[PDB]
mmCIF file with all atom_site columns, C-alpha atoms in Angstrom:
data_model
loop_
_atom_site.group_PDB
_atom_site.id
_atom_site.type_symbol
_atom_site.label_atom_id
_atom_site.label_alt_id
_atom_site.label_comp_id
_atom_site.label_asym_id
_atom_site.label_entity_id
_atom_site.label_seq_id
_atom_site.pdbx_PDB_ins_code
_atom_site.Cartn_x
_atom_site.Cartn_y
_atom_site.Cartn_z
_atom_site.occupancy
_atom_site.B_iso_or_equiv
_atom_site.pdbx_formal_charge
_atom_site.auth_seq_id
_atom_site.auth_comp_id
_atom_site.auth_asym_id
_atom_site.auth_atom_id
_atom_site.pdbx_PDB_model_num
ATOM 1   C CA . UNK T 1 1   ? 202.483 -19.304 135.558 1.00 59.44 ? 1   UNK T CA 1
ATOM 2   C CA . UNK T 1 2   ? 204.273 -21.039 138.050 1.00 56.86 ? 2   UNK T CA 1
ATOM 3   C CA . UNK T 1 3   ? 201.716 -23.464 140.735 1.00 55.82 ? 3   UNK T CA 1
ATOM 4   C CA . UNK T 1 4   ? 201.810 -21.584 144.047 1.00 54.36 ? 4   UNK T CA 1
ATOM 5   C CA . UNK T 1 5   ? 201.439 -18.214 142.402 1.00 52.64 ? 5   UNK T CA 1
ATOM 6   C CA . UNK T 1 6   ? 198.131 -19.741 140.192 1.00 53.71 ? 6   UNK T CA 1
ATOM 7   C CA . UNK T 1 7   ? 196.856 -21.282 143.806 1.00 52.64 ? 7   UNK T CA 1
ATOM 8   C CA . UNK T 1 8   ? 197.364 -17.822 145.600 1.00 53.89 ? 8   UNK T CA 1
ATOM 9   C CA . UNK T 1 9   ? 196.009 -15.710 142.692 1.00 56.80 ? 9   UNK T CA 1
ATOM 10  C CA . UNK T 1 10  ? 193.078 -18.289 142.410 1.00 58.48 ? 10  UNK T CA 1
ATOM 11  C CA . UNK T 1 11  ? 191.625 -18.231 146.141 1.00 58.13 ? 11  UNK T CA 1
ATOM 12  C CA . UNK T 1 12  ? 192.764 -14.818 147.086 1.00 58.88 ? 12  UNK T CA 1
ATOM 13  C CA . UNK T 1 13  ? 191.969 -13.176 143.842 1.00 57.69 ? 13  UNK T CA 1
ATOM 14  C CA . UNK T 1 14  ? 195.656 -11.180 144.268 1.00 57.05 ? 14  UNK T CA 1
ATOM 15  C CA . UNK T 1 15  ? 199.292 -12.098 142.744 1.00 56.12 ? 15  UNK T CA 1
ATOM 16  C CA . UNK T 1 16  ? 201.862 -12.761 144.681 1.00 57.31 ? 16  UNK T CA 1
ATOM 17  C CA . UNK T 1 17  ? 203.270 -9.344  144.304 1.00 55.54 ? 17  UNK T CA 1
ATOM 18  C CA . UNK T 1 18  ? 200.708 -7.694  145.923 1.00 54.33 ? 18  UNK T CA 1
ATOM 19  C CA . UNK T 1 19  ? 201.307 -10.720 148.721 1.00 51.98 ? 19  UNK T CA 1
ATOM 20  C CA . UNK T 1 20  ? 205.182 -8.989  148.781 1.00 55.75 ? 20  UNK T CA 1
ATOM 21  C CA . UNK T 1 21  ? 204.037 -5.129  149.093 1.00 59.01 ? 21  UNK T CA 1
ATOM 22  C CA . UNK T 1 22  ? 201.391 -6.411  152.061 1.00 58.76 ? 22  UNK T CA 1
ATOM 23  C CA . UNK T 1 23  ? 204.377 -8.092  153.245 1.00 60.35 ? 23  UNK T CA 1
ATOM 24  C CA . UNK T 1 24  ? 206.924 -5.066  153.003 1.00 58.64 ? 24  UNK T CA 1
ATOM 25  C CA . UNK T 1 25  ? 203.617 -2.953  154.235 1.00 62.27 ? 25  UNK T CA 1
ATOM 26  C CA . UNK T 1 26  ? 202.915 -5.059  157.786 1.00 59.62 ? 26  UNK T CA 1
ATOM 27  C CA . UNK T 1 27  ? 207.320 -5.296  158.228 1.00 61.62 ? 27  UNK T CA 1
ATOM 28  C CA . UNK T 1 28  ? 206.899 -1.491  158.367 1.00 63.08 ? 28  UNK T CA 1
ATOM 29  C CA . UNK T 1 29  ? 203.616 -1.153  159.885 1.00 61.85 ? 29  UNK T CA 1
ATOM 30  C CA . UNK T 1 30  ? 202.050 2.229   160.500 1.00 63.16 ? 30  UNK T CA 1
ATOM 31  C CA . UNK T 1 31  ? 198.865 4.287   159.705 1.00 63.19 ? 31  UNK T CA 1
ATOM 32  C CA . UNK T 1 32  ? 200.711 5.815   156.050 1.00 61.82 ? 32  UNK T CA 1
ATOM 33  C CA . UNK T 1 33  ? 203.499 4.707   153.789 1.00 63.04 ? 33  UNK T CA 1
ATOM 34  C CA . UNK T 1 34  ? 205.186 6.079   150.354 1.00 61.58 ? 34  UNK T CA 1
ATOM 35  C CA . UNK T 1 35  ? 205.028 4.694   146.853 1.00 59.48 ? 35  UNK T CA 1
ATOM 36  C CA . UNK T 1 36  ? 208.243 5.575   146.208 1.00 56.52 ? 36  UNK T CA 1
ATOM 37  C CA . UNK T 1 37  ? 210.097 4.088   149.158 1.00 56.99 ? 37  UNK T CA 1
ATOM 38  C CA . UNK T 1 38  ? 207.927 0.767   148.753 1.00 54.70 ? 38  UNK T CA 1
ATOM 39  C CA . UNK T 1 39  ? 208.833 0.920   144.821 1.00 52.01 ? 39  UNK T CA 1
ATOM 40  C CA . UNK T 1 40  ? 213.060 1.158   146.243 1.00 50.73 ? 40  UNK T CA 1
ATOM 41  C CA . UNK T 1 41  ? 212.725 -1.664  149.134 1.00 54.24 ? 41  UNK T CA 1
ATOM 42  C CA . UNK T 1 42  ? 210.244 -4.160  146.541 1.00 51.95 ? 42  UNK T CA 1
ATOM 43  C CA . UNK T 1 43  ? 212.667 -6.863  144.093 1.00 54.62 ? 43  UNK T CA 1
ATOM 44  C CA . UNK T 1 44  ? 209.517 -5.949  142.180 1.00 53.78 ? 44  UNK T CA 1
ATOM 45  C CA . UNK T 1 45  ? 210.373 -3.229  138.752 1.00 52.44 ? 45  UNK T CA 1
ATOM 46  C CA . UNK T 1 46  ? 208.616 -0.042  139.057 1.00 52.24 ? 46  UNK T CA 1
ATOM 47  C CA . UNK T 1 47  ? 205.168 -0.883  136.960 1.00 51.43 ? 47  UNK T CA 1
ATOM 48  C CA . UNK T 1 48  ? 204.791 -4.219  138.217 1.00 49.37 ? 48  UNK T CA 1
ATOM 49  C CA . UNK T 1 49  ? 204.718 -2.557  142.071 1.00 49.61 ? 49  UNK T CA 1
ATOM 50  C CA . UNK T 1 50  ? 202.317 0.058   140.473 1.00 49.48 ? 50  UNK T CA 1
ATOM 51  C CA . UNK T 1 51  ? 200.087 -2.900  139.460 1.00 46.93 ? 51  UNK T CA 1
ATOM 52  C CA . UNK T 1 52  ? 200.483 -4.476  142.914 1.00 46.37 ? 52  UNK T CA 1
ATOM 53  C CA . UNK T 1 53  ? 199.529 -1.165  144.105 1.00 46.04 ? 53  UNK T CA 1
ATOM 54  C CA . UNK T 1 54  ? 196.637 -0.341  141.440 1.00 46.16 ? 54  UNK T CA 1
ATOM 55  C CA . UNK T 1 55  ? 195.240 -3.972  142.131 1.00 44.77 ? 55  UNK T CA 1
ATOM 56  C CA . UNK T 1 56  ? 195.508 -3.582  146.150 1.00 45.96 ? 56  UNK T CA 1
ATOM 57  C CA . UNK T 1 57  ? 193.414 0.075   146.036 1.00 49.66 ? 57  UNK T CA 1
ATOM 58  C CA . UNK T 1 58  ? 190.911 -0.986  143.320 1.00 48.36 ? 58  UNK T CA 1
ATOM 59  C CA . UNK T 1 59  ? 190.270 -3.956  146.405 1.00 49.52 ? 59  UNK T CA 1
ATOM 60  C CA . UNK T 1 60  ? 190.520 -1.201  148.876 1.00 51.44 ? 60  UNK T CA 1
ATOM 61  C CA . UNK T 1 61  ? 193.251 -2.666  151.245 1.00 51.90 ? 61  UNK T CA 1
ATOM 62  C CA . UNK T 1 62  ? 194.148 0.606   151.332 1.00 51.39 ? 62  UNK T CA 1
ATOM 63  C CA . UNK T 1 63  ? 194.269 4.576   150.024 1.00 49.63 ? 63  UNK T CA 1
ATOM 64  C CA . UNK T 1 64  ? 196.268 6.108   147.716 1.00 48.70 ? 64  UNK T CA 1
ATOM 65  C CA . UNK T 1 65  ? 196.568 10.014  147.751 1.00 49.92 ? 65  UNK T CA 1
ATOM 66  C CA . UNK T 1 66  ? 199.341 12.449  146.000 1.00 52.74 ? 66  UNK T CA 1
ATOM 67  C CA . UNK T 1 67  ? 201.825 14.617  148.350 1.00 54.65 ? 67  UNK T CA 1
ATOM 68  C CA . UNK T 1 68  ? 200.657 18.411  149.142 1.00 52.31 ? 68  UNK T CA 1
ATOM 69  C CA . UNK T 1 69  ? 204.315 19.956  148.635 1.00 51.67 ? 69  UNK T CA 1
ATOM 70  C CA . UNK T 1 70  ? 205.625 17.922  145.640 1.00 53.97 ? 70  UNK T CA 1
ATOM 71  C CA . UNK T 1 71  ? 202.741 16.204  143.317 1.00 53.54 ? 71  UNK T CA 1
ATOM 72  C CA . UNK T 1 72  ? 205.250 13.821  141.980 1.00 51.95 ? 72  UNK T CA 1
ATOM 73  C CA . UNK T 1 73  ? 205.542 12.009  145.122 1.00 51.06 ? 73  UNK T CA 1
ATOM 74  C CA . UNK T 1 74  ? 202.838 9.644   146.059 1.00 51.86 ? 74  UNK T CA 1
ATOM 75  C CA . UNK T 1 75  ? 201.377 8.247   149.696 1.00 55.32 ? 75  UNK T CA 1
ATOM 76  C CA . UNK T 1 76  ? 199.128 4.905   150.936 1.00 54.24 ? 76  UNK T CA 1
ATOM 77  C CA . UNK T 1 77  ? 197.196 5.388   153.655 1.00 53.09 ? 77  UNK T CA 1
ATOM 78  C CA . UNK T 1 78  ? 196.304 2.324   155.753 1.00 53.81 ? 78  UNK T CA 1
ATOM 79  C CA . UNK T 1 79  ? 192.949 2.779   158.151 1.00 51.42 ? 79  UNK T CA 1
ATOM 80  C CA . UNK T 1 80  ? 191.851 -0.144  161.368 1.00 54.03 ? 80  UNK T CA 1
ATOM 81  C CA . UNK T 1 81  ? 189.682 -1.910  159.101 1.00 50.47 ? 81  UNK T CA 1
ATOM 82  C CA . UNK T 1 82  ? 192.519 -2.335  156.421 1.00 48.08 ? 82  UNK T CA 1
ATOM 83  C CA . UNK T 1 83  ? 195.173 -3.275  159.179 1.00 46.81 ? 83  UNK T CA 1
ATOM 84  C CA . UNK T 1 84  ? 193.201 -6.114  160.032 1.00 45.81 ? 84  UNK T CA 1
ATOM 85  C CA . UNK T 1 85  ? 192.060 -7.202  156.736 1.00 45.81 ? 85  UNK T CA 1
ATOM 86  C CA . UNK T 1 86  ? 195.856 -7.029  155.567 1.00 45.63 ? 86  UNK T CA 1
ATOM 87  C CA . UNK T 1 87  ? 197.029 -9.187  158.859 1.00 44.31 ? 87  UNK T CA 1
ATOM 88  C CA . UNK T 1 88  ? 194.326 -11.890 157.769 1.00 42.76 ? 88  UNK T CA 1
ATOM 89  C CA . UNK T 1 89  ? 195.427 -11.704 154.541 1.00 40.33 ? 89  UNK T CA 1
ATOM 90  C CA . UNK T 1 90  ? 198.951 -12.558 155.064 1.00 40.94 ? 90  UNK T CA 1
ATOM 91  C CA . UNK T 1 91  ? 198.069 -15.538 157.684 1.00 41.45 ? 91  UNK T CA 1
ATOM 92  C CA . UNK T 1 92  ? 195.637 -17.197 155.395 1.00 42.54 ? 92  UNK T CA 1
ATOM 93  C CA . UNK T 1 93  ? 198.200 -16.937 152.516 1.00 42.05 ? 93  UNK T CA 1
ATOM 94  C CA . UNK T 1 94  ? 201.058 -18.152 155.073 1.00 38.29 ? 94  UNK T CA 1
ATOM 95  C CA . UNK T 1 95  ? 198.548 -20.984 155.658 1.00 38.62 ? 95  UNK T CA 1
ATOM 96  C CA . UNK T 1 96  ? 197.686 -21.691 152.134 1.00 39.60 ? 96  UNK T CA 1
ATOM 97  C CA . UNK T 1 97  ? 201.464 -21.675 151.309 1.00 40.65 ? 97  UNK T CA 1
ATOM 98  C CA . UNK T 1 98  ? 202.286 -24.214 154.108 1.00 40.79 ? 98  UNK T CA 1
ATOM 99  C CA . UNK T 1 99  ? 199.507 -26.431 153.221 1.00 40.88 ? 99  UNK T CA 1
ATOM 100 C CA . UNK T 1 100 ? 200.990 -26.302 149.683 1.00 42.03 ? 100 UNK T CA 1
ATOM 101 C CA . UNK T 1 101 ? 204.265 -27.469 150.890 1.00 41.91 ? 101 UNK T CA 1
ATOM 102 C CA . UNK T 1 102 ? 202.414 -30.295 152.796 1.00 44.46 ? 102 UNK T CA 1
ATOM 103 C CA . UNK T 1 103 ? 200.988 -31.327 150.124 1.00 49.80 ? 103 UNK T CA 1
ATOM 104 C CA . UNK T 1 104 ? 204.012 -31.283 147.700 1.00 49.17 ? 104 UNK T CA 1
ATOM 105 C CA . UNK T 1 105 ? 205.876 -33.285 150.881 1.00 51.18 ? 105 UNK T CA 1
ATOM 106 C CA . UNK T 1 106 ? 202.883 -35.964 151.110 1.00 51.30 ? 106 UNK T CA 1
ATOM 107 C CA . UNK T 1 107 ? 203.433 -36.619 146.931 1.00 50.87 ? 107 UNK T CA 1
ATOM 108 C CA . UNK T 1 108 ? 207.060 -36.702 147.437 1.00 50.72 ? 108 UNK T CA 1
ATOM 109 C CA . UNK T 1 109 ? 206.626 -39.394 150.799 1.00 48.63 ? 109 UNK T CA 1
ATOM 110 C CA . UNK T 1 110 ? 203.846 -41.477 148.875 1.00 50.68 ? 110 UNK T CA 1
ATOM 111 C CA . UNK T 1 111 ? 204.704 -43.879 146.211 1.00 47.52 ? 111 UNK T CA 1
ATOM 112 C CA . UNK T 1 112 ? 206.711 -43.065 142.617 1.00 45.68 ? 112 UNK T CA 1
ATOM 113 C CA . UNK T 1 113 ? 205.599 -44.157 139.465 1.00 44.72 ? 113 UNK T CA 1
ATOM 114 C CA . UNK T 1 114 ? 207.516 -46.985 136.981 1.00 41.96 ? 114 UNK T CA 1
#
């Protein structure tokens, strides 16, 4: 795995995929969103957004419910509580990543080996 993903996924217990669809989720925010237009607007494939996804409701940052007119078609709902959790989840993992790049800028300033 590559560092800053392992360092994310470690203290946030979430990939940085499901950083990305919070990401494309708070660019676009409102109260409900669909599966299928996060899945098109995601660099993500289809089953590794549906992971994302799958991860993200099993840790309830929000709902997932199927359309009334056409079944195929899926929804995420996103309720107050959830918008705020998903806001302080994005600026502790800005933070996180910035403090990474400090860090990786204080080894690169310091001293090189022989």
């Amino acid at each position: 795995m590559d560092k800053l993903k392992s360092l994310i996924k470690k203290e946030f217990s979430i990939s940085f995929e499901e950083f990305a669809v919070l990401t494309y989720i708070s660019e676009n925010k409102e109260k409900e969103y669909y599966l299928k237009d996060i899945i098109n607007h995601l660099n993500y494939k289809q089953p590794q957004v549906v992971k994302a996804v799958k991860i993200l409701s099993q840790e309830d940052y929000f709902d997932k419910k199927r359309n009334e007119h056409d079944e195929r078609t899926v929804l995420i709902l996103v309720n107050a509580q959830q918008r705020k959790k998903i806001e302080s989840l994005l600026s502790r993992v800005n933070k996180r990543i910035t403090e990474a790049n400090n860090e990786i800028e204080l080894l690169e300033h310091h001293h090189h080996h022989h």
